[PDB]
């Protein structure tokens, strides 16, 4: 490869808003790459250290009926909701674990075509709606890119609907590095899943249509080498050859409440690292 190590030190946790209000809500999002594999790699021990109010998980690869028992040993996240593929098999899948029960939990995006792979959970709270998503990969050889574009449109229109009623927080694996700054090797990936012009545009359209703001990039518009994903292959993580695929996207009305948007680079357990959002609601 042409890449060597590129340093990134995630700055300190800013736990107060620009107005001086302390953070009241702490959300953590993490593509676990297999719930049971993740647990075996002591992912839960890190959740305990982070002590989030809400935990959102993607790629659980686990049915709602076959959760591992250790999730019961998770103290302050007793309200747990799961969505998995309708075929009841072990792939994709998302989860949402919360300190308090949402006003309402929904699954999918109200479109039968896009709701069969357990990719979305909607949790409505008093002052905002939380959506966690595992966006369909464009696929090897981009064989699923045409569907991904259909997904992008439907998902975008769905979120616009939600945001019309309450402020929206979208988090999870959106499977795209928006800009060149969001991955280590933009040049060699323009025709690969996660950095096709199609996918990058879909992200821009998402920000515009709903509308939503990239919380991390809002606070750190010029910070390079901040990634949330590295291939297991090729010693990529140690060299920091990665992609920023995991986001917290906020309604514009929530920006005054934005305290910080973190990337927990050193937390192991998956090929993705956790991200954490501080909000002063």
Curated annotation (Swiss-Prot):
Q: What induces it?
A: Up-regulated in presence of reactive oxygen species (ROS), like bleomycin, H(2)O(2) and phenazine methosulfate.
Keywords annotated in UniProt? Acetylation, Activator, Cleavage on pair of basic residues, Cytoplasm, Disulfide bond, DNA damage, DNA recombination, DNA repair, DNA-binding, Endonuclease, Endoplasmic reticulum, Exonuclease, Hydrolase, Magnesium, Metal-binding, Mitochondrion, Nuclease, Nucleus, Phosphoprotein, Repressor, RNA-binding, S-nitrosylation, Transcription, Transcription regulation, Ubl conjugation
Binding annotation for Mg(2+) 1: 31, 59, 271
* Site, as annotated: Transition state stabilizer: 175
* Binding-site positions, Mg(2+) 2: 173, 175, 272
What controls its activity? NPM1 stimulates endodeoxyribonuclease activity on double-stranded DNA with AP sites, but inhibits endoribonuclease activity on single-stranded RNA containing AP sites.
Which cofactor does this sequence's record say it needs?
A: Mg(2+); Mn(2+)
Positions where Phosphoserine occurs in the chain: 17
Q: Where is this site: Important for catalytic activity?
A: 246
Resulting phenotype, residue 28 to S: Does not abolish NO-induced nitrosylation. Enhances NO-induced nuclear export
GO CC entries: centrosome; chromosome, telomeric region; cytoplasm; endoplasmic reticulum; mitochondrion; nuclear speck; nucleolus; nucleoplasm
Other remarks on this protein: Extract of mitochondria, but not of nuclei or cytosol, cleaves recombinant APEX1 to generate a mitochondrial APEX1-sized product. The specific activity of the cleaved mitochondrial endodeoxyribonuclease appears to be about 3-fold higher than that of the full-length form.
Role of this protein:
Multifunctional protein that plays a central role in the cellular response to oxidative stress. The two major activities of APEX1 are DNA repair and redox regulation of transcriptional factors. Functions as an apurinic/apyrimidinic (AP) endodeoxyribonuclease in the base excision repair (BER) pathway of DNA lesions induced by oxidative and alkylating agents. Initiates repair of AP sites in DNA by catalyzing hydrolytic incision of the phosphodiester backbone immediately adjacent to the damage, generating a single-strand break with 5'-deoxyribose phosphate and 3'-hydroxyl ends.
The name under which this protein is listed is DNA repair nuclease/redox regulator APEX1
Q: Which organism is it from?
A: Homo sapiens (Human)
Q: Which gene encodes it?
A: APEX1
């Amino acid at each position: 490869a042409s890449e060597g190590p590129a340093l990134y030190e995630d700055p300190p946790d800013q736990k107060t808003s620009p107005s001086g209000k302390p953070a009241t809500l702490k959300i953590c999002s993490w593509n676990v790459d297999g719930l049971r594999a993740w647990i075996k790699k002591k992912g839960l021990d890190w959740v305990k250290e982070e002590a989030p109010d809400i935990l959102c998980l993607q790629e659980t690869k686990c049915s709602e009926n076959k959760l591992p028992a250790e999730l019961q040993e998770l103290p302050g996240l007793s309200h747990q909701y799961w969505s998995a593929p309708s075929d009841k098999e072990g792939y994709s899948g998302v989860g949402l674990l919360s300190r308090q029960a949402p006003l309402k939990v929904s699954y999918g995006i109200g479109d039968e075509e896009h709701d069969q792979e357990g990719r979305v959970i909607v949790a409505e709270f008093d002052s905002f709606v939380l959506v966690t998503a595992y966006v369909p990969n464009a696929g090897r050889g981009l064989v699923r890119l045409e569907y991904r574009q259909r997904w992008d449109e439907a998902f975008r229109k769905f979120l616009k609907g939600l945001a019309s009623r309450k402020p929206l927080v979208l988090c999870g694996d959106l499977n795209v590095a928006h800009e060149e700054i969001d991955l280590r090797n933009p040049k060699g990936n323009k025709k690969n899943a996660g950095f096709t012009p199609q996918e990058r545009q879909g992200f821009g359209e998402l920000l515009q249509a709903v509308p939503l703001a990239d919380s991390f990039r809002h606070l750190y518009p010029n910070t390079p080498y901040a990634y949330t994903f590295w291939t297991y292959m090729m010693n990529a993580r140690s060299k920091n050859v990665g992609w920023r695929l995991d986001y917290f996207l906020l309604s514009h009305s929530l920006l005054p409440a934005l305290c910080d948007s973190k990337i927990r680079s050193k937390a192991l357990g998956s090929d993705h690292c956790p991200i954490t959002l501080y909000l002063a609601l």
